[PDB]
Design an enzyme around this catalytic site. Structure first.
Site, mmCIF file in Angstrom:
data_model
loop_
_atom_site.group_PDB
_atom_site.id
_atom_site.type_symbol
_atom_site.label_atom_id
_atom_site.label_comp_id
_atom_site.label_asym_id
_atom_site.label_seq_id
_atom_site.Cartn_x
_atom_site.Cartn_y
_atom_site.Cartn_z
ATOM 1 N N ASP A 1 0.807 -1.209 0.000
ATOM 2 C CA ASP A 1 0.000 0.000 0.000
ATOM 3 C C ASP A 1 0.859 1.288 0.000
ATOM 4 O O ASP A 1 0.396 2.334 -0.431
ATOM 5 C CB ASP A 1 -1.030 -0.037 1.154
ATOM 6 C CG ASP A 1 -0.404 -0.302 2.534
ATOM 7 O OD1 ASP A 1 0.833 -0.500 2.657
ATOM 8 O OD2 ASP A 1 -1.185 -0.347 3.502
ATOM 9 N N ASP B 1 4.665 1.066 13.450
ATOM 10 C CA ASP B 1 3.971 -0.226 13.596
ATOM 11 C C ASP B 1 4.695 -1.403 14.291
ATOM 12 O O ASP B 1 4.008 -2.194 14.945
ATOM 13 C CB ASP B 1 3.447 -0.716 12.223
ATOM 14 C CG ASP B 1 2.473 0.283 11.545
ATOM 15 O OD1 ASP B 1 1.708 0.970 12.261
ATOM 16 O OD2 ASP B 1 2.469 0.370 10.278
#
Ligand SMILES: [Br-]
Ligand SMILES: [K+]
Length: 731
Positions: A36, A449
């Protein structure tokens, strides 16, 4: 000018969301993966690693690193197309494109579209939007978002245009009323899937199935090669078709539906089977939406092409206690699940998992409380794929990796499948900061993350991210110049944000106390002797001083919230700060700051760095095309800055070991020099620059975090937002 450099990733393996895995239906071992924010990849079976295909996407066209769809030609495996573009709101200034290649993505050519592509928007797990006709391979379809409908190329993706007879552009958006202009976009036409038996080699395929994000009109079909489209009679309503897979062996279309567009949510849905001959619909859900035990919709639909009575589907989404996969060996009549409850909170598993090659995938907790395990099966599992050339091979994407099995049919005889990471060479982290101290490990990363790592060896995946505390995202990290075993970092937690300190170089960290109001980590600076921390947490209304090494905090009046704090690398008493065109200085080890420069430095600049070994020597990089831009330097502890006339634009700066027989550290910038964008090095205090990257190695929106290496001449640690942490060495 231009010098020959070697660019590699610091070895991490994965670290991001992989919304799409695509096997070539003709050629064994030809596999691609779309991300993405980190471009596309092709598998190299000979090295057992992924090869990135989009590193040539640079600074001006950075959005083309969002890869919404990818198709690989079954009638010519040299051909591959990618739909690229990152956002359909204002975050991406440019429209998308369809990229075309005839050498498996070593080279490409772009056809820009008149609209945006949402490679990092909601809806991105749904696919594939791109589909090539399997009998007449000059024909390619693309299902578009934003209301634009269905788009077609008849000349191998050279020109595109709207299929005007496909009138339903779709109406679903995750939340029409989002103030932030991000959840409120029309996700649109979501997959295209051909019937191969509807044509012969060289001739237009006559039967085409289309998935649309419109709960009342989810599935369309042409029966005349895309001249005219009809809503497909008898079809179910209420849901969104994430995936549509046709099997021409038995004359059946399987669809998986969810109540949301994904990838992060989905509470309800069904799996259906449409029989082409008869026009009949059967609900084949493992758990139907009519049951209220169902707490997810469905995606990860994949058919075993070597045996198309076999097929699987997966939860979209089940966060807790983990994802669920399902398998049928009889065309969905019945299903078995990859785990089952025994007596709560215990479970039986049809899989084992081995993460020896990527040990940080336990997230620094091997033994979380039942029912949870670690590592987990997965989440955001929109792509799950059985290898069309081998029924024993499956691969799926998660929010952080790709897992793969080689013994999938062990499931069918009552055994346990073995799953292992398969992400070597795929390097997808967003690097948020980085440092290279002059003793110990070469570099420490601060990542989005998955935390960040001390990296003992650049070729070896580290054991664990930082722990005690363990940020989901480490936003800032510093070491004390004079005593580099003393470090600090800050970052995000479920509960807002936090700080971590250490005095044995990360050997053990402990968590300190927060000041009031912390919503995120923000940024932090450590004095040169380790004797003071200044911390601009996010959310908090001030910048704060600790003299007690994280135990207590005092507000500093004068400084705005979120100013960029850096410390002098020689004088423990000097701290520096930058915010909206003002530079500030402290000479009392943090207690107070005064504005020193209020004009002639640009308002958008927010990267500056003090030089190891040089008291009061600060470089500063930033600006915009619409204002002023460049690189500035102070040698007088922030009282005055001079613009370097050698540089037209800079976005970040750092330093590393001087060239042999030079008197000053090498200076590396992200920037524009003599009308050329790239990465640049100066070994003469900024009088001249040499380009150290090239046009195949641009890495999009890179450079948020960079660091030189004080021990190693010519080395840059180069941070990206989607392609992990790079190191460049001169050759
Ligand atoms: Br859940
Ligand atoms: K759910």
């Amino acid at each position: 000018p231009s010098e020959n450099y070697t660019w590699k990733n610091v070895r991490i393996d994965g670290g991001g969301f992989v919304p799409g895995i695509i096997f070539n239906q003709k050629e064994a071992d030809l596999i691609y993966a779309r991300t993405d924010i980190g471009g596309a990849y092709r598998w190299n079976s000979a090295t057992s690693s992924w090869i990135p295909l989009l590193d040539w996407v640079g600074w001006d066209n950075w959005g083309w690193n969002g890869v919404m769809s990818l198709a690989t030609d079954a009638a010519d495996p040299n051909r591959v197309y990618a739909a690229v573009g990152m956002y359909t709101n204002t975050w991406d200034p440019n429209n998308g494109a369809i990229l075309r290649s005839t050498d498996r993505g070593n080279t490409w050519q772009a056809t820009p579209l008149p609209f945006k592509v949402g490679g990092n928007m909601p809806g991105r797990g749904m696919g594939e939007r791109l589909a090539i006709d399997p009998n007449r391979n000059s024909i390619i379809y693309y299902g578009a978002e934003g209301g634009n409908g269905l788009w077609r190329s008849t000349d191998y993706g050279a020109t595109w245009a709207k299929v005007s007879s496909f009138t339903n552009g779709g109406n679903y958006a995750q939340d029409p009323n989002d103030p932030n202009d991000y959840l409120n976009k029309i996700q649109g036409v979501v997959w295209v899937t051909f019937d191969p038996a509807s044509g012969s080699a060289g001739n237009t395929s006559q039967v085409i199935y289309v998935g649309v994000a419109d709960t009342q009109n989810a599935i369309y079909r042409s029966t005349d090669g895309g001249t005219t489209w009809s809503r497909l009679a008898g079809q179910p309503t209420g849901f969104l078709p994430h995936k549509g897979v046709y099997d021409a062996v038995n004359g059946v279309l399987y669809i998986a539906y969810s109540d949301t567009g994904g990838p992060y949510d989905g509470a309800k849905g069904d799996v259906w089977k449409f029989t082409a001959s008869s026009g009949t619909w059967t609900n084949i859900s493992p758990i139907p939406s009519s049951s209220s035990d169902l707490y997810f919709g469905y995606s990860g639909l994949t058919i075993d092409r070597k045996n198309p009575n076999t097929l699987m589907v997966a939860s979209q989404i089940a966060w807790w206690p983990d994802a669920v996969f399902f398998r049928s060996t009889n065309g969905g009549a019945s299903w078995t699940r990859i785990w089952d409850w025994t007596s709560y909170p215990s479970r039986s598993f049809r899989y084992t998992m081995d993460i020896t090659e990527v040990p940080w995938l336990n997230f620094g907790n091997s033994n979380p409380v039942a029912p949870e395990v670690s590592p987990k099966l997965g989440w955001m599992n929109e792509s799950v794929e059985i290898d069309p050339h081998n029924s024993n091979r499956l691969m799926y994407g998660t929010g952080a990796t790709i897992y793969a099995t080689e013994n999938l049919t062990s499931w069918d005889s009552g055994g346990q499948i073995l799953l292992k990471p398969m992400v070597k060479g795929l390097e997808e982290t967003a690097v948020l900061d980085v440092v290279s101290p002059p003793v110990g490990a070469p570099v420490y990363s601060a990542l989005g993350d998955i935390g960040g790592f001390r990296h003992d060896d650049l070729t070896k995946v580290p054991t664990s991210m930082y722990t005690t505390p363990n940020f989901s995202s480490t936003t800032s990290i510093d070491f004390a110049e004079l005593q580099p075993a003393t470090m600090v970092r800050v970052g995000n937690l479920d509960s807002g944000g936090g700080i971590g300190v250490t005095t044995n170089a990360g050997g053990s960290w402990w968590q300190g106390q927060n000041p009031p109001g912390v919503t995120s980590g923000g940024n932090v600076a450590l004095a040169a002797d380790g004797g003071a921390i200044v911390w601009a947490p996010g959310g908090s209304t001030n910048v704060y001083l600790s003299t007690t090494f994280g135990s207590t905090w005092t507000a500093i009046s004068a400084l705005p919230a979120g100013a960029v704090i850096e410390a002098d690398r020689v004088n423990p008493n000097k701290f520096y700060a930058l915010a909206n065109g003002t530079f500030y200085v402290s000479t009392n080890k943090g207690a107070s700051f005064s504005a020193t420069v209020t004009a002639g430095i640009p308002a958008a600049a927010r990267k500056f760095k003090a030089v190891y070994g040089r008291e009061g020597d600060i470089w500063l990089a930033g600006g915009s095309s619409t204002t002023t831009y460049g690189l500035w330097r102070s040698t007088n502890s922030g009282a005055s800055f001079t613009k370097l006339a050698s540089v037209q634009e800079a976005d970040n700066v750092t330093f590393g070991k001087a060239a042999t027989g030079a008197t000053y550290p090498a200076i590396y910038i992200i920037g524009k020099v003599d009308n050329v964008r790239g990465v640049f090095r100066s070994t003469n205090e900024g009088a001249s620059w040499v380009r150290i990257n090239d046009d195949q190695r641009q890495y999009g929106n890179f450079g948020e975090a960079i660091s030189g290496d004080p021990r190693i001449y010519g080395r840059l640690y180069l941070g990206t937002n989607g392609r992990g942490l790079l190191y460049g060495d001169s050759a």
